[PDB]
Symmetry: D3
Subunit: 318 residues, 6 copies
């Protein structure tokens, strides 16, 4: 890239995501990666982990425009990932989700615009597509915020777009680390609905998606990566095989209310989108979900799993 000599700021950068971005990009021609957040602890661990003079750490938060403006000054590109992203916590403190997810984004955009930042990519979730919960509601509203802003601001000034992705394999919310635990534990693997589906997205896929929008999105665009899926039963089988393990699979029936599949595009959006090859693009103005994609055989699932670092490390140590 492309990032040659530029300065990238990542809000919410002390995450899984920020970390993936740093691995892939730190040793590039990029001039700096700034990590903007409130947690001095995590920032310190990350500092000590990379010992890199291009990692710059800024204390502040997206609800605090002052603290944003300091982080933003001289920045070329922003990946905007800060958010209150857990369902119960948005459901109990929706004002907090509003201040962080929605007003927080507004703050980021305004600050980037004022600093003449070239591009902002706002990360969103599959849960913004059929907003059912407070986290998802806040996220859908966040997308209306950047989409609205993008109309009023020339592209050549600041380009503003976003992405959606869902479950990341082996991340916090992934069932993979729970399954592998249970294998190592000599425990049964508990499935509720074995045909419940997720798109298959690793951490690198997600970073590749934001990079794609970074390169190719028009202002106002929502960008989504084409991805196969798999049932969770097929995934539990793929893992047992990988680990040459024989732990009882205990199928227990639907926990009444769980997400059956992941919707990345609604009927409405899919009807409007551009097929770009490996990505769909929804320009600023049946459904694309994990049940109606290419669903993977146990064997192909094994192949995907094996491109996962977290999975390779578990497999050696075992």
């Amino acid at each position: 890239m492309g990032f040659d000599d530029k300065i990238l700021l990542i809000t919410g950068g002390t995450g899984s995501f920020g970390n993936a971005v740093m691995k892939r990009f730190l040793d590039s021609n990029i001039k700096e990666i700034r990590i903007f957040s409130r947690d001095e602890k995590k920032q310190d661990d990350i500092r000590k982990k990379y010992n890199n003079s291009k990692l710059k750490f800024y204390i502040g938060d997206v609800r605090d425009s002052q603290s944003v403006e300091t982080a933003m000054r001289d920045v070329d590109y922003v990946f905007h990932a800060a958010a209150l992203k857990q369902v119960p916590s948005c459901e109990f403190f929706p004002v907090e989700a509003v201040k962080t997810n929605i007003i927080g984004t507004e703050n980021v955009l305004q600050s980037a615009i004022h600093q003449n930042v070239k591009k902002v990519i706002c990360l969103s979730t599959d849960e913004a597509a059929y907003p059912i919960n407070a986290m998802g509601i806040s996220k859908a509203m966040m997308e209306k915020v950047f989409v609205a802003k993008s109309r009023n601001i020339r592209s050549e000034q600041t380009l503003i777009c976003g992405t959606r992705y869902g479950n990341v394999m082996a991340s916090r919310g992934s069932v993979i680390p729970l399954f592998i635990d249970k294998i190592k534990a000599g425990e049964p693997l508990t499935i509720t609905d074995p045909d419940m589906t997720r798109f298959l997205m690793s951490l690198e896929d997600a970073v590749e998606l934001v990079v794609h929008a970074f390169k190719h999105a028009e202002t106002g665009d929502i960008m989504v990566q084409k991805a196969p899926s798999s049932t969770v039963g097929d995934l539990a089988t793929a893992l047992l095989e990988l680990f040459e393990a024989d732990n009882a699979i205990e199928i227990i029936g639907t926990r009444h209310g769980e997400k059956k599949a992941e919707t990345l595009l609604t009927r409405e959006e899919y009807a409007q989108c551009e097929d770009m090859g490996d990505y769909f693009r929804v320009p600023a103005d049946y459904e694309y979900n994990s049940d109606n994609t290419h669903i993977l055989t146990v064997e192909e699932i094994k192949e995907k799993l094996l491109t996962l670092e977290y999975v390779r490390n578990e497999l050696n140590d075992y």
Copy 2:
């Protein structure tokens, strides 16, 4: 009632709604009805229309807590109707919709709580059920706000609940005044989808719904009125007959994107609700919509229409 000697504040009260509330209640035992809003013009017209010493008018807005606190002081009950409620305007200015619909409600609740207001009823829309647009998104988030607040505040202190209703017949967004215009004009009546459906709700029904929640809702409850529906074709036929008119009905096909039906309860909510007789109640935690209610014959539609003042006035004058 029940409102005997009490003080009711209505935000967004310079509306259709506020006006209905005043007609029904002004000549009661209520001590005052305060009308809280920014528009001095409308407040003045309403003042001159009723010439009633119990109508008190307060200048301010829900984004301005100071101005709320003044209106709130000594208030018993609040019907919280202020909102930015039009689709394009929320879609172009979603921050504004956030500040008004979501933070604005937070302001109202906080102020009412501090003033020891007994009850707040937050009006919502059918569009909060499957939030697809920015107005609907803001509204669904508003409901998460009151529902969250209601958990943290004792009922005996302030009770906090809300209602949903959809299209009101012969109101601003109703197709009735457009149809009647076209009759009087000697014009065709243009239908896009003749089987598109709306619940049948007059203005008095809506006021009766808020009154019901006022009397019977628990804190955290969303309350919805059971109502028949009708197709728009059947409605265009009922009107032509009422007016003994013979204007060509021009059926033109779906305008690609229009709301086909009204959803008052989602699969999820309907699954959780209590049937109360004439109302469903969703307690703080397939679908109820206008296609799967009692749908009305042309003849029953005529009967409903005739309970409408706006319709009776048009019918005499013609």
Copy 3:
């Protein structure tokens, strides 16, 4: 003009005034007219009335600088008309009048200055000349605000000036629509003081005044249009004659406290002003009022009245 290819923003634009400005200018070489205000309803009616792609509508208010900044971006000229302008409403909510009329103007100026807007014209009232009521007090303070700002900011940067005018014939506060009603009603016309006087200003005159300041005012200037006046008795006579009507004039004596005349310039200001031909100009630092101007015969009053659209429409329909 002159407005060729420029972008004009009008706060308080959903008014009588904004509407006059749009009629006169929409079909010109102007690139856009933006209408900035909180009321989505009115904005929507105006949208539907003109069906013009150059009318741009912005939701926000002058107390909210964020929402101003969005409206202001890339704007060439501002006519600043937003205000809380009714006497009782300023008298009961003077803080609200302060926030809107005075701080609101400060917000507008600051935002325009930051956006490099070329010119701001702040509309004021005859009531700022001898501020007796809260509305008038707020308005006089508003003029001190723009006048002060204009000293600190180079003209070539942003020019800042204002206008005063009083009663507009046939507008909301005009006695003309009440008189014409009474004619059509077969009712008496009630006068309190028949020699009470108003300057004679139509809506087009007012728009012409702002246009004049727009073209010719120096920064810090207050601009006022020279206008004849008439007693209200003479005006009631002119109307009866126009309508060839014979309704009893009931003269009832002064309502104790009413405005006897309109003061556009104080002794002090008139002593400082420049006579410009058709306008007086008060540069940033006996009286000019409706009793000591050219007062009109019944016959000349008829001629003025007839240049009024509102009057021409009433006269045909009758």
Copy 4:
């Protein structure tokens, strides 16, 4: 009094006024006098001057509600004197005058109300009667603010009223210290208009006025003290005589724009007022001015002057 065991807060208390209040009241049964302002220097001098454990000093300002709330906690009565009171400074920084004089008062009232303060007396000026300048405009608007608040708040809760007085003899703006200087200097005394008039008010009179409102005003009342006046020529003569001095009086003609007389009540207010004996009272809803009061002979002027401490000290030392 009456102030027995109570706590009085004085904003703007580091003044002439605050000092007069402290002299008269410190050695009483009052429990504390709190002096609220931003200037640590003056507060320190006053501390060192009285060495009194009942003088409590609070740092903050009326624009800062936090800092007010701290000063207000447990307070019984407030004399609200903080203000930006000089003409050029309000004329150049009217926003500052607005924030201090008008919003600042709002802050004070709100804070006092919340703390259950029994009484607030807001000091105003003769210049609020025919507001011609920015200071006077801000002051008239301040009176609308307390008058409005007083309507909404029960008397038994917080009583809110104000006073007006004009020139205080021998204070900062008084011509007395300039005349006496000129006497001691062997210089001429320069008069512009010898018949220009001021009410005759000493510092003790002013404190007596606020005390009167404190005791007898209803909420919403403006209170004014009846006072004789004198021309300035008569005053220059009275002083020369007192000092048995023979300095040339140089009469130089009106400086074009100077205040000729002091208006304490407008035609409008005087028409509404209650004569209370030694005070007029304007209840919340020709003129009383220094030309139409009892005007004093040179001999009576000498008698008034001699009740002045500042005058007695000059007279001994000379």
Copy 5:
């Protein structure tokens, strides 16, 4: 206790400290422990760790008074531990340290006072005693904030006090986990200054200190626990012995600038303090440091170390 049926809020509760408090108190008669902070992740882990219905988690931060007020409502006692506590991060973002450590505390106090919270204990650091760095400076200023507030607020209302402690053994900043790592690693243990000293404080000691202030501090008090110390050389020897390990100790000389000892009380404070038995108390108005306490033999150090859970777990596993 004592905490029987009460509600305790802990800001900064997702820490080492908050965790210690929960272990010791969760299984008591306490009615709730609320954990107030911005990090949903940590709050979620802690939720899953204790599975206790008395742990309540609140999202918000101390810079956000709204979010505090929600957490504070009905609270009996507060342990105020939220802070930006790392040296470089305060040194690079001192405004952030100010907003969090100083204004943040002000917010907490104000909110607790308004909610009638009985007691607030503000945790401070040894580094507030001779503030040399930005973190220490912010902390000393924090103590002036609570000490000032405590003067103005009756004890019986809200009692406000604080504590200081320094290094906690085996916590984040402790050298113990680095030494034990090096043992297990077969690595040398690197000492810079072997006679550099720390007070010996475990996590339980710290919790016992706050509990002590909770029970016995007067309002305005700073409370400090009496504790022995040890050199780091003696500590490295005690560990090697415990682990029956023989790793080379590499003494490397002072890193030029490191903290040689810990000062809990200055000359000034120690001169003012009350010796309470096991604690010193500094009432609201040579030095006590780790060099001039009871310094421990290698053998006594071993005994202290062994009362440490972190040390016992390492010792078994090895």
Copy 6:
């Protein structure tokens, strides 16, 4: 200079300091000196004292960014002296000291940066070196604020540095005016500790120090002037001799807690500083104090004293 045609703003300019700056610079080639503060009284006296069209006065305060921005517009250099500088007042209202000394400076820097001001010099105190009191604590934190800002902002943009000086001879806190009073009074001179020491700094020295930083400091630098000192006993002797007076010196012993000496540089800072000739410079990252400088004989003290205007005026008049 150097100040030729430039515009200098002085916050806290109504002081001793601001006055010294005006004397030295008003009659230069400087284009304007703006004096920014809240006190209209002092600003008015200063206006009347110099009658200079280059003195511009701005009303506002450093806590109010709006009011700063107005003062800052087009400014070349800022000497930032506004502060709450007295010990008891910071000790009783530390929040106020925080808002003024620390956030206030942040405001100033931000505003200057945005206005492209070339240089800001922040005045600090010797008391920031071993912050023991709330005023000193606030001041040390202020230095961390400018030092942090200076790292993030290019020098060529805005240079940001500060100075420290201690007691100014014959200023408010100087013992000189108390001694001279006592001489003229025929009173004893009371000393507590005769060997207590202060650096010897006149008002001109201080202004020369800020000027030096103005010319030569790098961004982030703290600058301090090399100065001799004297004991207070030696100073009391020098004065008695100057005045050829024989008043009893009453030595009374240390008031337990008084400042024995002045520390301008800590061990730490002195270890880092650059000796510049007449100044030390601490670049952005045993002790220098009044006991270990060149201490002056009674005779040299007399010579210093005589370069003091305040001393020369007392000496003539006596």
